[PDB]
Design a protein around this ligand. Sequence first.
Ligand SMILES: NC(=O)c1ccc[n+]([C@@H]2O[C@H](COP(=O)([O-])OP(=O)(O)OC[C@H]3O[C@@H](n4cnc5c(N)ncnc54)[C@H](OP(=O)(O)O)[C@@H]3O)[C@@H](O)[C@H]2O)c1
Ligand SMILES: O=C(O)Cc1nn(Cc2nc3cc(C(F)(F)F)ccc3s2)c(=O)c2ccccc12
Length: 315
Amino acid sequence: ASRILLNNGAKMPILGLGTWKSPPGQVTEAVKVAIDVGYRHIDCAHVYQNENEVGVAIQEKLREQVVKREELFIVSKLWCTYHEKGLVKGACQKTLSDLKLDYLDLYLIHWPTGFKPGKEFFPLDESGNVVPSDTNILDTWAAMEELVDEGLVKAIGISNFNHLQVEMILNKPGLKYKPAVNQIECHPYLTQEKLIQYCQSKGIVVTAYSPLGSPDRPWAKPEDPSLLEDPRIKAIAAKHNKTTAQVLIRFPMQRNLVVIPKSVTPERIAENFKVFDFELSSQDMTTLLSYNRNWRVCALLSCTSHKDYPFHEEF
Ligand SMILES: NC(=O)c1ccc[n+]([C@@H]2O[C@H](COP(=O)([O-])OP(=O)(O)OC[C@H]3O[C@@H](n4cnc5c(N)ncnc54)[C@H](OP(=O)(O)O)[C@@H]3O)[C@@H](O)[C@H]2O)c1
Ligand SMILES: O=C(O)Cc1nn(Cc2nc3cc(C(F)(F)F)ccc3s2)c(=O)c2ccccc12
């Protein structure tokens, strides 16, 4: 099926459009094209600085009656500088205002690490270390739970939480709502078997980000691995008469993951959606899993001393 049941009883489309790095000038048309060709899930964040322009598209398509709001699954995320309890509602309300929505389908704690509040997204000390906030993830979660109880969001979740962090939420004293989703980096170079099996065993749906290896990440280097140019992946695509990107989006779908490829290129937006008409074989799946190398796109150096940095640990 094209949608997966979450623990809040709502259904989530397993293919969504990513919006990180989509320039503000091109993301409105990008989202329009996406909705036009089938996408019903959009992955957003305040930190991406383009939620206004995303919302312009959603609103035009709602006004145009191309789609109904109930048919849309719009995801945003709470940025690290707003983990304080007094700041969570306003952060969510800013996002809703910019997206031109009265609710989000899903609102994630974006990273487990809280940073000092201020106008700066990445407040640093004079030596380049991120300035933490003394907020912890459990209190941030109570704040997220309040958003459900106020009708601003239909589901809450986390993002970039390791197994021990997930476990801390599930084991939170007085837990009122379990997390619906954990959104983590996942592709054939970072396969996450252990963390995914842990989350799924607990009824937490996993969304895979950077499924193409985020070739437009601004810190990419010549010697980094490249998924889209991996001849072993290209061969698998050739076998199926599909593109390499199509294989890389179908791969997580078959692991019962949600996947959110980003493009602002209309022909790639459409290509990326044409992944429901073919199957990878079990052997194809194990073969792609074998390319794991624990290679991470998203793991900023300046953040490695935060007490709650999620990637020292095994998973
Ligand atoms: N939770 C978090 O911490 C977190 C972190 C990272 C990402 N995410 C979410 O996940 C989304 C996807 O990850 P991502 O943006 O890092 O990268 P991605 O989706 O792995 O890669 C996007 C890059 O691939 C290109 N591309 C897309 N389709 C292609 C195709 N069919 N053939 C060739 N190239 C193609 C895009 O180019 P064009 O755009 O020029 O077409 C862009 O350069 C984000 O945008 C964001 O919504 C969340
Ligand atoms: O955030 C996205 O969606 C994409 C994303 N990733 N990264 C790499 C990051 N690595 C982190 C590591 C931690 C850590 F938790 F590990 F400390 C905390 C926060 C971050 S941001 C960025 O620096 C970034 C900057 C602007 C907009 C989006 C991003």
